[PDB]
Design a protein around this ligand. Structure first.
Ligand SMILES: [Cl-]
Ligand SMILES: [Cl-]
Ligand SMILES: [Mg+2]
Ligand SMILES: [Mg+2]
Ligand SMILES: [Mg+2]
Ligand SMILES: [Mg+2]
Ligand SMILES: [Mg+2]
Ligand SMILES: [Mg+2]
Ligand SMILES: [Mg+2]
Ligand code: NA
Ligand code: NA
Ligand code: NA
Ligand code: NA
Ligand SMILES: [Sr+2]
Ligand SMILES: [Sr+2]
Ligand SMILES: [Sr+2]
Ligand SMILES: [Sr+2]
Ligand SMILES: [Sr+2]
Ligand SMILES: [Sr+2]
Ligand SMILES: [Sr+2]
Lengths: 140, 186, 160, 95, 154
RNA sequence: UUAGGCGGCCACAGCGGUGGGGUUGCCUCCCGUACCCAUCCCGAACACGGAAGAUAAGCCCACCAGCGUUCCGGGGAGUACUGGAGUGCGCGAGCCUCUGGGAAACCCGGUUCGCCGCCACC
RNA sequence: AGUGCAAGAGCAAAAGAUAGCUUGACAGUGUUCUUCCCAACGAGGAACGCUGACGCGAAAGCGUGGUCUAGCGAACCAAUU
RNA sequence: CCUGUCAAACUCCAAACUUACAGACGCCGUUUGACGCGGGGAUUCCGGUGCGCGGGGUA
């Protein structure tokens, strides 16, 4: 029961919300894989009337790439309980978002007979802090 | 759910099991549907027709009943998918069915996939089905060659239980050979 | 303008403000009088003024009757007396006047009125057995300023 | 009426009851009728094509052949006989 | 079985109501017909309710009216027991009356006109501006009320 | 249907909740990227290959009515409204009687936590 | 929400969005309805066919312009194919 | 939560009633030929009143 209940990292999303790009290059080095362009929506007074146009870049790491990054990434932050989502997620900062979830999360990500994960199988800030804190660092 | 005016989707839609828009287009042919479905371990082919109170399956074949004709191999692969279509196809021919349109449900039209193998299998059984040859994996892969070469990169047998070490696409031939033959007890 | 012009319900309901502009403001000062911080439950006596005929009452009449009614209650129970009275109807019906002969006569907007079916309570007061005859006298003055004849019906009050 | 287009005064008859909103089930859009069959005509708000003139909603005609996938339905408008082209989606068998 | 008598003329009566009377074979004021109590016939009398007098007559009364106003499908031949016996599936007027009231046959089936052309009500009727319950002659009557009327119009 | 596939009706099926279930069986989660195929970046998904583990999700079975929905009883109500008729009443706006139909809100007590068809399957 | 524009209506694994590809906004000829309820009347419009040639898709299929109802013009004469 | 009111261009509801088709009864038609079809001749295209339902208008 506990085996299919113990949390895990689904994805590590590192992104730099600029506002006009050239920054892609560093993310590629700090993470290990190709970054992606970020387009914006709606016209913006702040000389941002152009809808589809580069404004940021992100990277979604999964599995090793995720941990190998967090290893030398988490030590760079001072995690606090507040910095945690209601789903058991947390982000710090260049931004670093960590998406944590239980074993059969795919049930809500597959094409056929997908289903929303029950509030019971959903992760919690509490169960989140633990898992993480239970690995190279401290909470609050 | 929320109130009187709330709109709940059709059941097969909530269950995320039936693409109704694709279904309609499918049914517009007037021909039966070769329903190709797949499980983590198995593959199923059904020849379905329209009915007053629901659909009518006229013939079908599951990868399980493959062993019934001499199959000691796994059932969630290409050779399995093809032969399964062929068996369902053959039985289809038996019940009088002569043509069909491929219904892959919520699966993707990926070139060379198993839903397409099921289709090539059903076609070889003599069923007339609108298709496209260059979307079907090439013969060898259907035989299961891709898995043989994979077992070549051995060091540890690909299959746990022992069906064979370097596997056998030749077994595919035996079974297909057995099906294309008349004697067979459909 | 005479009420004979609008007292009857001889026209479609005309209330949609999304299709009507220039609607004059209501002259009704208040719909809840007396001590509105208190509940009507806290009173032994409840008397209502019931309209005996179905009619339309222009906001100008609601204000005159209500005024002359509450005005009496204030002069008899005090500007803080232990009572409460309610004007439960609101003038939703917009009225017109065609003020050029009968050509393109759709009238211009000139006011508002409340439709009241016979037997309905226009006003309702709640008092103590003491001031029961004072609320009855306020209504006598009120119904003298509205088209129809009215009934002064006593609801909770078995102190006869 | 203020205008005379085909959809004049059709607010009610061409609007779905709230819960019948959304794509309709394919079964009735594929139904097959035989010549001679009595069929009630009623446009399905959710189905754009294959409709007849709204003025005929409520008629109970007679299938007298087909044109492509649509059906040719015979009706009597007042005293005049007319043929209506309509798809199964807007038809229902009588009784 | 109910006896139907038109008491109000055709001028100004709705056409669909006048046609209903004609379908019930009544084409004149004071004309009477016998109608089976069926759902179909029930709607018809209900529609003509305000221009007619109706109800179930007694065996005797029916016999009196048949003897006095019944007529052959064609011809002036008087209708008496002998006529009845020599022309119908019954022995005398009584047998016919019973069969009619029990709804086993109809005046037509027995070669009789479907209509009894009654005489104006002797002593006058109760008026055609109000129903029975209000003291008038219109609408559904008592077996006794219907009998009183039919007899006065024998 | 000791867990499957395709459906019809499209909430009586929704929302929410509780309990129960799987050694070579089923569905899954699950393990894993040489291939077919795949990600404007990610074997996440899609696709392919496969069984070390699991019944915690899903799913299936049993069930709970608090919300939403369906239908039923009793009350509201033969009220509201209404087709036909009237030398009935009212200054009048309007009302009444006879005849034939007949709600809605809401309250209270039940019902409803899907029904059904085809195929396959210890 | 969006879906060019009035209003009312339609639409969620889409009729909306993004990406890519494409030119069916195609030629010929009809059926039917509408215009004009019933009930005769032109231009115009729409739905639905057949034939030809194509686009996309694995395929069923979709595309006779824009989700639907406004955006239109006789004879004579001219120019054009 | 409680408490006071509404809608020609509002509707979770919802009549009476109007209406398509069919069966039944009624009535009608097969020498009075109905229903339908073709052809000749028109007149007519200032209407009015009561009742019901209206919309405009103080009326
Ligand atoms: Cl599948
Ligand atoms: Cl049409
Ligand atoms: Mg309307
Ligand atoms: Mg005679
Ligand atoms: Mg008299
Ligand atoms: Mg459990
Ligand atoms: Mg009078
Ligand atoms: Mg000229
Ligand atoms: Mg030119
Ligand atoms: Na970009
Ligand atoms: Na629909
Ligand atoms: Na489970
Ligand atoms: Na035309
Ligand atoms: Sr008026
Ligand atoms: Sr007065
Ligand atoms: Sr994985
Ligand atoms: Sr007067
Ligand atoms: Sr009843
Ligand atoms: Sr279109
Ligand atoms: Sr009408």
């Amino acid at each position: 029961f506990h085996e299919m209940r113990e949390p895990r990292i689904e994805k590590v999303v590192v992104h730099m919300g600029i506002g006009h790009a050239n920054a892609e290059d560093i993310l590629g080095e700090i993470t290990g894989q190709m970054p992606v362009r970020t387009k914006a929506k709606r016209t913006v007074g702040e000389f941002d009337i152009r809808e589809g146009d580069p404004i940021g870049a992100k990277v979604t790491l999964r599995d090793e790439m995720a941990e190998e990054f967090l290893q030398t990434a988490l030590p760079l932050a001072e995690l606090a309980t507040s910095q945690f989502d209601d789903t058991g997620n947390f982000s710090f900062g260049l931004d670093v978002t960590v998406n944590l979830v239980r074993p059969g999360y795919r049930v809500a990500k597959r094409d056929k007979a997908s289903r929303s994960i029950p509030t019971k199988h959903r992760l919690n800030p509490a169960d989140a802090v633990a898992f993480i804190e239970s690995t190279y660092d401290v909470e609050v | 759910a929320t109130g009187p005016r709330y709109k709940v989707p059709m059941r097969r839609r909530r269950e995320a099991r039936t693409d109704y828009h694709q279904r309609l287009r499918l049914l517009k042919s007037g021909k039966p549907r070769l329903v190709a479905r797949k499980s983590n371990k198995h593959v199923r082919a059904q020849l379905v027709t329209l009915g007053p109170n629901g659909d009518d399956t006229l013939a079908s074949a599951h990868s399980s009943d493959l062993a019934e004709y001499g199959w000691e191999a796994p059932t969630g692969n290409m050779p399995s998918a093809y032969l399964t279509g062929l068996l369902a196809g053959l039985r289809a021919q038996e019940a009088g069915v002569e043509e069909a349109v491929l219904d892959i449900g919520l699966n993707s039209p990926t070139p060379g996939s198993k839903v397409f193998a099921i289709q090539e299998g059903a076609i070889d059984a003599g069923l007339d089905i609108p298709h496209n040859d260059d979307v079907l994996a090439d013969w060898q892969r259907t035989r299961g060659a891709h898995i043989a070469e994979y077992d070549e990169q051995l060091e540890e047998p690909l299959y746990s239980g022992d069906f064979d070490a370097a596997d056998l696409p030749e077994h595919f031939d035996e079974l297909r050979e057995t099906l294309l033959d008349g004697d067979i007890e459909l | 303008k005479p009420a004979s012009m609008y007292r009857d319900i001889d026209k479609p309901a005309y209330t949609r403000r999304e299709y009507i502009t220039g609607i004059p403001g209501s002259k009704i000062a208040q719909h809840k009088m007396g001590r509105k911080q208190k509940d009507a439950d806290d009173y032994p006596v409840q008397i209502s003024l019931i309209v005996e005929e179905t009619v339309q009452l222009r906001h100008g009449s609601l204000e005159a009757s209500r005024l002359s009614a509450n005005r009496h209650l204030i002069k008899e129970l005090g500007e803080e007396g232990d009572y409460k009275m309610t004007l439960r109807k609101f003038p939703h019906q917009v009225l017109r006047e065609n003020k050029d002969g009968m050509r393109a006569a759709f009238g211009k907007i000139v006011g508002t009125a409340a439709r009241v079916q016979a037997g309905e309570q226009l006003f309702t007061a709640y008092c103590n057995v003491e001031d029961a005859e004072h609320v009855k006298e306020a209504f006598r003055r009120a119904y003298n300023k509205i088209t129809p004849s009215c009934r002064i019906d006593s609801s909770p009050a078995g102190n006869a | 009426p203020s205008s005379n287009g085909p959809l004049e005064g059709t607010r009610g008859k061409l609007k779905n009851k709230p819960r019948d909103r959304g794509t309709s089930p394919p079964q009735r859009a594929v139904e097959e009728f035989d010549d001679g069959e009595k069929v009630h005509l009623k446009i399905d708000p959710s189905v754009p094509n294959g409709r007849f003139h709204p003025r005929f909603d409520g008629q109970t005609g007679t299938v007298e052949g087909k044109q492509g996938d649509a059906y040719k339905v015979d009706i009597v408008d007042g005293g005049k006989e007319k043929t209506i082209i309509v798809t199964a989606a807007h038809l229902r068998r009588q009784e | 079985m109910h006896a139907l008598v038109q008491l109000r003329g055709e001028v100004n009566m709705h056409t669909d109501i006048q046609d209903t009377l004609e379908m019930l074979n009544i084409h004149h004021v004071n004309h009477c017909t016998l109608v089976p109590e069926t759902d179909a016939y029930r709607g018809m009398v209900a529609k003509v309710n305000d221009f007619v007098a109706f109800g179930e007559p007694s065996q005797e009364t029916l016999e009196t009216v048949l003897a006095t106003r019944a007529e052959p499908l064609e011809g002036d031949a008087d209708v008496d027991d002998e006529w009845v016996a020599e022309h119908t599936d019954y022995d005398d007027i009584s047998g016919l009356a019973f069969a009619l009231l029990s709804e086993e046959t109809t005046l037509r089936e027995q070669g009789l006109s479907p209509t009894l052309r009654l005489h104006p009500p002797r002593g006058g009727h109760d008026g055609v501006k109000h129903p029975v319950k209000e003291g008038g002659q219109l609408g559904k009557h008592d077996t006794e009320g219907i009998d009183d009327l039919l007899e006065a119009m024998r």
